[PDB]
Amino acid sequence: RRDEENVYYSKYLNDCIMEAELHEFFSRELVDAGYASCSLCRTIDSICVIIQCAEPEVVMGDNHYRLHKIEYLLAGRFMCDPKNFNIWVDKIIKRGLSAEIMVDNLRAKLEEAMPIRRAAYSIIRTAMRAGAAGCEVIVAGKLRAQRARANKFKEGCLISTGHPKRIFLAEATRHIKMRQGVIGVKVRIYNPNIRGAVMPDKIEIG
Amino acid sequence: VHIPKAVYKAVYAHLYENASLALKEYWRVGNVPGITYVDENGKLCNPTYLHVNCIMQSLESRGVVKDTFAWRHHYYLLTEKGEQFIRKELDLTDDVLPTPYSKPSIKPP
Amino acid sequence: RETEFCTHIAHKRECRICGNYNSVYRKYGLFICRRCFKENAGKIGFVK
Amino acid sequence: DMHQKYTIIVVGKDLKLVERYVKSIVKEGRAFGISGPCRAPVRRLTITTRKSPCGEGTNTWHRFELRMYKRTFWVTCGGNDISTILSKTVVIPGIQVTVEVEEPDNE
Amino acid sequence: DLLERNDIEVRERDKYTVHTLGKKKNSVAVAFVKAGKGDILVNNVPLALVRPEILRTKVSEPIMILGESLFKGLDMNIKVAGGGHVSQIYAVRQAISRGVLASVKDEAARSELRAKLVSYDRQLVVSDPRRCEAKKFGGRGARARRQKSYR
Amino acid sequence: GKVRTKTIKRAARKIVENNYESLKPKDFQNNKAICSKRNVAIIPSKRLRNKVAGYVTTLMNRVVKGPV
Amino acid sequence: SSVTRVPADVFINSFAAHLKNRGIIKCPAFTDYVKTGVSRQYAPRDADWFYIKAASVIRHFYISGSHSIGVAGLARKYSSLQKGKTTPHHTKRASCKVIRSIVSQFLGQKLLIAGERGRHISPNGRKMVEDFAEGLQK
RNA sequence: GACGGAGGGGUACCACCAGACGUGGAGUCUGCGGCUCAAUCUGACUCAACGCGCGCACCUCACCAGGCCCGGACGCGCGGAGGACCGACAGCCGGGCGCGCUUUCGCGAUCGCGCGGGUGGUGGUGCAUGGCCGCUCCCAGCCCGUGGCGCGAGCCGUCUGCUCCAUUGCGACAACGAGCGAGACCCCGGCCGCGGGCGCCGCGGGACGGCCCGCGGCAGCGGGAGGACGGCGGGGCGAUAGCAGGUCUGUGAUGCCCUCAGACGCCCUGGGCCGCACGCGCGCUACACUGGCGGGGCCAGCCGGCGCCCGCCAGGACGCGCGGAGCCCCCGCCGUGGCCGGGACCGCGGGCUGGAACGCCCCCGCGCACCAGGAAUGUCUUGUAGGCGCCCGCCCCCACCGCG
C-alpha cells in the first residue's frame, strides 16, 4: 500500500515547462550563434544549461558578460537564486546538418534580396557537405505575385513518414515576415548518420 | 503617472545588479516581482506594478534596456550603453558591481 | 482612479505561452493552451 | 557518522535515460548497501485535444501522454557520505534526483 | 486488483506446494494447493456456495470431469480479484483445473487429465486471448460511430 | 494473406546464395541464427529476422529441389 | 467457518431474528419516517429492515475485522442508482447516519469496538456470531 | 486529364448481402436556421456546418445599456518648480467614487501643450498570407538518373498478364538502374523466461504462411496440425498533387486595412449569448413484467484519500492520513390496469458553491406526453454489437457531451 500525494512529481513538470520557456527565449536571442537545443540539469537546485550552437564562443562573445546578463536574466525570470543558473554551451560539429541552424541561415539571406532558388540550393549545398542523405527546402508565402504558393526544392532521397522519421530526419519552421507579408520558410534535413538506430529496411549481407 | 522618484533609482541599480530585468508582464494589479527594494521612506516592500512597466517602455525607447518578450513574462536586458546611463544617473563615479560569476567548467553533457 | 482600476477580482487564468483567456487547459497546473499545446509540447515533452 | 537510511527517488521521463541511471546507482551500492530496484507503477499524465486550431474539420483528437518514471532504491549510510557516492553516478541531463532520510521517528 | 505483488500474501505455505494462477478476461484466480481434505475455499468461500448459483456447475466442472480420485484429499486456497462477477468464475475454473492436472503432472496422468481437459474446453488448458478494445476518436465504442449528419 | 516485401525477398536471396549448406530446409531457427549472425548478416529487429528466416527456409526448399 | 462455511446472507436473516431475540440494539423510531438512501427513493417496508441492516453491519465488520472500517464504507456497500431524472442513471450513496446510528449503538453491545479511524468487530462480537455458525450448519 | 445511363478487371458494413442495433414518431438535452430584442457576440451549410471553435449569474465576452481613467512611451519646439501636473474630505449629483457641482484644502515636476512618432485594438479581408487541422487519400499511388520515342504536348520504365492489406510480390519485359509512399518501424496487449522488487516492472524470447498435404513456372493459395497468438490485435504517424476547405476571434503569427482620447485602448456596474411562433442535427430518458419495485451479495478497470459526532437527505462541524462500479444475482412486492410504467412540468421548503443565483443539489407533494413509431436514412463482424456503470477534459458552482 502506498501514499499517492507524491509531492515531487510536479517539479520535473515545472522543469519541463522551463525547458520549453528556455527554448523560446533562446531562439529569440541566440540566432547568430546557431542555437539548436537547450538542456536543464538541476540536481541540488544547481541550474546547468547545455545550449547547442554552431560555434560556442559565439554565445559567450565578451568574457561571458553577454552570457551573464542573460544568465542572471534567466535566474531573475525563473526565481532561480542568482548565480545558481549556469550555461556551458557545447560546440556543434557538422553545423549545417542540424536543421534549426539551416532554416535560420536561410531566413538570414531571404530577409534581404537573395533569390529563393539560389538560397535553396545554397542550403542544399550545406546538407550534402554534412553527409545528409538529402535536404529539402520548402519556402511558402507571397513569393512573386500576391496570390501565394510554395516552392519545394529537394536534393537527394528524403523520408518523413514512419518511426525512422523521428529518429533519423530532423526539421524546423522559421516564420520569416518580409515587407509584403509572412513568407514562412521550413527546411527538413534527412540524416541516416544517427548511430542510435539502423533503418529496419536496411540489410547487410556477406 | 506622477510615480514616486525612488522607483527610478530602484530599477536602475537592480537592472545593473543582475545586468537584466526580466519583468512579469501583467497589466493587472498583483504581486510585483524583482525590485522588492524601492528604498524605504514610504515602503518596505515592492512598488506599484504600473510603475516598472511604464518606465520600461521609456528605458527601451531611449535604449537604456533591450527587450525580447518571449512567453507571458518579458525578457528585458540592460544594453551595452545602458551601463553608462545607469552608472551616470545613479552618480556612480566608476564601474560598480554587475553580474559575471567567473567562467564555467566543462559539464557532463 | 484608486477605486476604479480593477475593483473586480476574478480567476484570471491565462495560457502562459499564449495569454489566452480561453482554452487554458490547466489539467496539471500547465497552461499550454488547447491549441498552443502541440507547438510547445515537443520541447516540454509529450508523446503520441 | 549518522547511519540514517536515505530513500532513493529518481524522476526521469525517458525510460532508457532513467535505465542508464539505474545501473550506475546500483553500482555505487557496492560502496554502501543499495536496495533492490522499485521501478514506479507508470504514471502517464494524459492530455487529449482537438487537432484543429479552429473548430472546422471532423473532430480529430491528438492523444498526448508522457510517462514520468520514478526509480526507488533504499540506502542506509552516513548522511554526509551519500552525497559523495553520487559523484560516481552518471550526471546525464534532465533527471530529478532526491535522497530522503528514513529517520527512526525522533523519539 | 490483479497482477499484484500480494497475489497471495497471508499464506505462510506450510504444504501448499502446487501454486497455480487463472487468467480469464482481466481476472486472476491464484490457487496455492496442498494435498489436504478437498477444501477449495476460493476467496475464502467454500466451493459449495458461490455468488452466481446457475454458474456453480461451471466451477464444479473441473472438479467433476477430473473426478475425485485425484481431486479428493486435495485443498486449494484460491484468491480471486479483478474483473467481474462471472469473468472471475471462469478464472476460478482455470485455477482449479490447472492445479489437479498439476498435482500429478510429472506422472503420465498428465496426458489422461489433459484429454479430459481438451474434450471439455481447450480454454481450461490455455488462457483466454480476449480482453477489451480502444474507443474511436469519433463516436462511442471500438466498433460504433455517431449517426451521420445529412448524407 | 501473406506475400513478402521486396526488402525481405532481396536479402533472403543473398542469404541463400551466401550459404546454402549452413541454412536448413525446414528448421527456421537454424536459418534465423545465420540471418542475424553479425558478420554473416544483420537484420534490425527480430520480426524482420523472422521474415527473412521464413523465406530462406522456403528458398532453401526451392534451392534443394529444382532451384529458381 | 463462523461465516465462511455458511452463506453469510442466509445468516443475515437468522441473526436478524436473533437481533430482536437477543435484544441487541433497538428500532430507533426513525425506522417509520425515513428512507434508506438518496438513491433508494423507495422507503424500506420490511419493518425489520434496521435488524437486517444491523446484521449486515456486523457481517461486513466481522470479515474485515480490525481493518478500521468506517461508517461511510459500510453505507456505500448497498449503493444504488438514482432514477426519476431523465439524465443517465449514476450510482449514489445510502444514508450514512441511518448506518451511523447502527454502529454507534452497536459500540455499547460490544460487537463494535473503538479503534484508530473506523471501529472494528470486538473480540466479544467475534464470539457471538460464531455461535450461529454452528446453528446454521446444524 | 475529367467524365461515360462505355466495356473488361478489382473493392469496403464510411456500400450492400445475412442479420443486428438504431434514429425519424414521444418527453427532455445540446447546438442550427427563423422570430424577437437594447443586446439576443460571432464564424461554420452534402460528405468535409449543426455537444463544432473544449461546463456563458461576474470574469470569460468578442454583444448591448451605461460609466471612469490614460498606462499618448521616445525625440523636436516651447511653457513651467512654491511649483507643471496629480489628488482631496463636508454636502449635492450620477447605481455609484471629487465622476461632475459648490467649496478650499492638499500635491511635487514623476511634467503641461502641440509637432512628428506611440502603447494598443476576440475591430475587417482566410478572396493578402504563415502555420496548423479537415478532405481528396480505409488508395496505392508518386517520381528520378541515364538511354529509347516522336517537331512537340507527352509517353517508355509505370505491364491485360500473375498473386496480395497494398505499385504486396511474381513472371514477362527499349527500356535499364534507383528512390519516396506502402510494408517495415513504432505503441499497448496476448504468452513465456530471467533480473529485480514500497506499489508488479525492467529486460529478453516467441509466430515465421514456419511446419503438413494438395494445386500452382512462380507469386502463392486452399484444407490441416501443434501453438499465448494464424496469417495487421482496437494499435499512432502521414506518398505525390492540391482545395479561393476553415481560423486575422490562439499569440510579440503577419500584409494591407481600420480605429487611436468623447479610443474599436483599458478598467467598472448592470444585463444578453440560454431570450426564443415555428422547421432541423447529433443526443438523454420513456413507452413497463426478459419489468418498476424490500432488502440482501456484490464484482471492476482508466485506477482510487479516508474517519468521527450533527443531519431522512442535501449538507455541515471536528479531524486525520487513508481505502473500490453498476449491470446482474438470491429471495419478497405488484398484475398488463396509462398501472406501483414513465418522469416532463408546477408549488412550498432544506441546501451548498459563490462579492453577487439567475446555477446546481435534496425532500414533501404535483404525475406531461408516451402502448413500440409516416415518408426517409445511420452504424457495425467477438470481447464486437448492444446492455450497464466509472473517472476526467472543461469548472467558485454546474453532464443528457467529450477522451478514455
PDB file of C-alpha atoms in Angstrom, chain D:
ATOM      1  CA  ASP D   1      28.513   9.105  11.017  1.00  0.00           C
ATOM      2  CA  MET D   2      24.726   9.165  11.393  1.00  0.00           C
ATOM      3  CA  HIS D   3      23.873   5.787   9.821  1.00  0.00           C
ATOM      4  CA  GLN D   4      20.454   7.066   8.651  1.00  0.00           C
ATOM      5  CA  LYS D   5      18.728   5.420   5.676  1.00  0.00           C
ATOM      6  CA  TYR D   6      18.131   7.706   2.700  1.00  0.00           C
ATOM      7  CA  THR D   7      15.271   6.540   0.446  1.00  0.00           C
ATOM      8  CA  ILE D   8      16.383   6.978  -3.221  1.00  0.00           C
ATOM      9  CA  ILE D   9      13.879   8.524  -5.713  1.00  0.00           C
ATOM     10  CA  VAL D  10      14.875   9.292  -9.383  1.00  0.00           C
ATOM     11  CA  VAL D  11      12.200  11.051 -11.519  1.00  0.00           C
ATOM     12  CA  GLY D  12      13.150  10.611 -15.220  1.00  0.00           C
ATOM     13  CA  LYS D  13      10.657  10.513 -18.124  1.00  0.00           C
ATOM     14  CA  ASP D  14      12.893   8.776 -20.735  1.00  0.00           C
ATOM     15  CA  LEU D  15      12.599   5.095 -19.768  1.00  0.00           C
ATOM     16  CA  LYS D  16      16.016   4.442 -21.429  1.00  0.00           C
ATOM     17  CA  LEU D  17      17.779   7.528 -19.951  1.00  0.00           C
ATOM     18  CA  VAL D  18      16.493   6.507 -16.478  1.00  0.00           C
ATOM     19  CA  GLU D  19      17.582   2.905 -17.268  1.00  0.00           C
ATOM     20  CA  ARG D  20      21.200   4.096 -17.725  1.00  0.00           C
ATOM     21  CA  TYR D  21      20.993   5.939 -14.352  1.00  0.00           C
ATOM     22  CA  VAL D  22      19.681   2.776 -12.548  1.00  0.00           C
ATOM     23  CA  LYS D  23      22.711   0.625 -13.471  1.00  0.00           C
ATOM     24  CA  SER D  24      25.254   3.258 -12.206  1.00  0.00           C
ATOM     25  CA  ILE D  25      23.182   3.931  -8.996  1.00  0.00           C
ATOM     26  CA  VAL D  26      23.116   0.152  -8.249  1.00  0.00           C
ATOM     27  CA  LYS D  27      26.910   0.060  -8.845  1.00  0.00           C
ATOM     28  CA  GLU D  28      27.629   2.606  -6.073  1.00  0.00           C
ATOM     29  CA  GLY D  29      25.599   0.333  -3.757  1.00  0.00           C
ATOM     30  CA  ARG D  30      28.746  -1.824  -3.601  1.00  0.00           C
ATOM     31  CA  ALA D  31      30.146   1.213  -1.679  1.00  0.00           C
ATOM     32  CA  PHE D  32      27.085   1.494   0.629  1.00  0.00           C
ATOM     33  CA  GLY D  33      24.277  -1.152   0.548  1.00  0.00           C
ATOM     34  CA  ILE D  34      21.947  -0.297  -2.438  1.00  0.00           C
ATOM     35  CA  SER D  35      18.399  -1.794  -2.112  1.00  0.00           C
ATOM     36  CA  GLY D  36      16.634  -3.806  -4.872  1.00  0.00           C
ATOM     37  CA  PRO D  37      15.045  -1.596  -7.569  1.00  0.00           C
ATOM     38  CA  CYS D  38      11.423  -0.446  -7.079  1.00  0.00           C
ATOM     39  CA  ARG D  39      10.531   0.996 -10.511  1.00  0.00           C
ATOM     40  CA  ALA D  40       7.329   3.097 -10.320  1.00  0.00           C
ATOM     41  CA  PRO D  41       3.806   1.959 -11.495  1.00  0.00           C
ATOM     42  CA  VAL D  42       3.944   4.002 -14.753  1.00  0.00           C
ATOM     43  CA  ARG D  43       2.358   7.468 -14.310  1.00  0.00           C
ATOM     44  CA  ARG D  44       1.010   8.638 -17.717  1.00  0.00           C
ATOM     45  CA  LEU D  45      -0.261  12.252 -17.345  1.00  0.00           C
ATOM     46  CA  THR D  46      -2.758  12.345 -20.269  1.00  0.00           C
ATOM     47  CA  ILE D  47      -3.801  15.306 -22.489  1.00  0.00           C
ATOM     48  CA  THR D  48      -6.192  14.684 -25.478  1.00  0.00           C
ATOM     49  CA  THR D  49      -7.057  17.765 -27.614  1.00  0.00           C
ATOM     50  CA  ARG D  50      -8.901  18.684 -30.842  1.00  0.00           C
ATOM     51  CA  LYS D  51      -6.140  18.694 -33.502  1.00  0.00           C
ATOM     52  CA  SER D  52      -7.623  21.620 -35.489  1.00  0.00           C
ATOM     53  CA  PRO D  53      -6.589  25.128 -34.317  1.00  0.00           C
ATOM     54  CA  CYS D  54     -10.097  26.253 -35.469  1.00  0.00           C
ATOM     55  CA  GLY D  55     -13.272  24.169 -34.957  1.00  0.00           C
ATOM     56  CA  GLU D  56     -13.543  23.314 -38.688  1.00  0.00           C
ATOM     57  CA  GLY D  57     -12.932  19.752 -39.904  1.00  0.00           C
ATOM     58  CA  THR D  58     -14.272  16.489 -38.465  1.00  0.00           C
ATOM     59  CA  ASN D  59     -13.432  16.475 -34.753  1.00  0.00           C
ATOM     60  CA  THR D  60      -9.908  14.987 -34.798  1.00  0.00           C
ATOM     61  CA  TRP D  61      -8.190  14.392 -31.452  1.00  0.00           C
ATOM     62  CA  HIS D  62      -4.388  14.223 -30.924  1.00  0.00           C
ATOM     63  CA  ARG D  63      -3.584  11.895 -27.974  1.00  0.00           C
ATOM     64  CA  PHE D  64      -0.659  13.240 -25.862  1.00  0.00           C
ATOM     65  CA  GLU D  65       0.784  11.229 -22.899  1.00  0.00           C
ATOM     66  CA  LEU D  66       4.265  11.409 -21.305  1.00  0.00           C
ATOM     67  CA  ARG D  67       5.241   8.730 -18.756  1.00  0.00           C
ATOM     68  CA  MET D  68       7.250  10.334 -15.907  1.00  0.00           C
ATOM     69  CA  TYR D  69       9.073   7.376 -14.287  1.00  0.00           C
ATOM     70  CA  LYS D  70      10.311   7.237 -10.651  1.00  0.00           C
ATOM     71  CA  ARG D  71      13.055   4.749  -9.604  1.00  0.00           C
ATOM     72  CA  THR D  72      13.212   3.660  -5.965  1.00  0.00           C
ATOM     73  CA  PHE D  73      16.180   2.246  -4.020  1.00  0.00           C
ATOM     74  CA  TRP D  74      16.808   2.445  -0.240  1.00  0.00           C
ATOM     75  CA  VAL D  75      20.361   3.183   1.065  1.00  0.00           C
ATOM     76  CA  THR D  76      21.459   3.317   4.755  1.00  0.00           C
ATOM     77  CA  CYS D  77      24.841   5.086   5.125  1.00  0.00           C
ATOM     78  CA  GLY D  78      26.297   8.246   6.694  1.00  0.00           C
ATOM     79  CA  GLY D  79      24.244  11.349   5.828  1.00  0.00           C
ATOM     80  CA  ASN D  80      27.315  13.270   4.595  1.00  0.00           C
ATOM     81  CA  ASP D  81      28.642  10.109   2.827  1.00  0.00           C
ATOM     82  CA  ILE D  82      25.715   9.574   0.375  1.00  0.00           C
ATOM     83  CA  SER D  83      26.456  12.943  -1.330  1.00  0.00           C
ATOM     84  CA  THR D  84      29.991  11.701  -2.225  1.00  0.00           C
ATOM     85  CA  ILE D  85      28.551   8.395  -3.671  1.00  0.00           C
ATOM     86  CA  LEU D  86      26.517  10.467  -6.179  1.00  0.00           C
ATOM     87  CA  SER D  87      29.816  11.729  -7.671  1.00  0.00           C
ATOM     88  CA  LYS D  88      30.208   8.214  -9.143  1.00  0.00           C
ATOM     89  CA  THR D  89      26.613   8.124 -10.582  1.00  0.00           C
ATOM     90  CA  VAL D  90      26.412   9.444 -14.214  1.00  0.00           C
ATOM     91  CA  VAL D  91      25.083  13.050 -14.481  1.00  0.00           C
ATOM     92  CA  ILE D  92      23.173  12.547 -17.801  1.00  0.00           C
ATOM     93  CA  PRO D  93      20.917  15.712 -18.053  1.00  0.00           C
ATOM     94  CA  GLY D  94      17.254  16.446 -17.129  1.00  0.00           C
ATOM     95  CA  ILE D  95      16.787  13.932 -14.257  1.00  0.00           C
ATOM     96  CA  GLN D  96      15.488  14.976 -10.810  1.00  0.00           C
ATOM     97  CA  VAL D  97      17.305  13.034  -8.032  1.00  0.00           C
ATOM     98  CA  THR D  98      16.418  13.285  -4.312  1.00  0.00           C
ATOM     99  CA  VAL D  99      17.530  11.301  -1.213  1.00  0.00           C
ATOM    100  CA  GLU D 100      15.262  11.495   1.871  1.00  0.00           C
ATOM    101  CA  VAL D 101      16.160  10.411   5.451  1.00  0.00           C
ATOM    102  CA  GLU D 102      14.211   7.339   6.709  1.00  0.00           C
ATOM    103  CA  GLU D 103      14.846   8.609  10.275  1.00  0.00           C
ATOM    104  CA  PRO D 104      13.640   6.489  13.249  1.00  0.00           C
ATOM    105  CA  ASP D 105      10.817   8.870  14.256  1.00  0.00           C
ATOM    106  CA  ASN D 106      12.578  11.350  16.588  1.00  0.00           C
ATOM    107  CA  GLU D 107      11.517   9.940  19.990  1.00  0.00           C
TER     108      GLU D 107
END
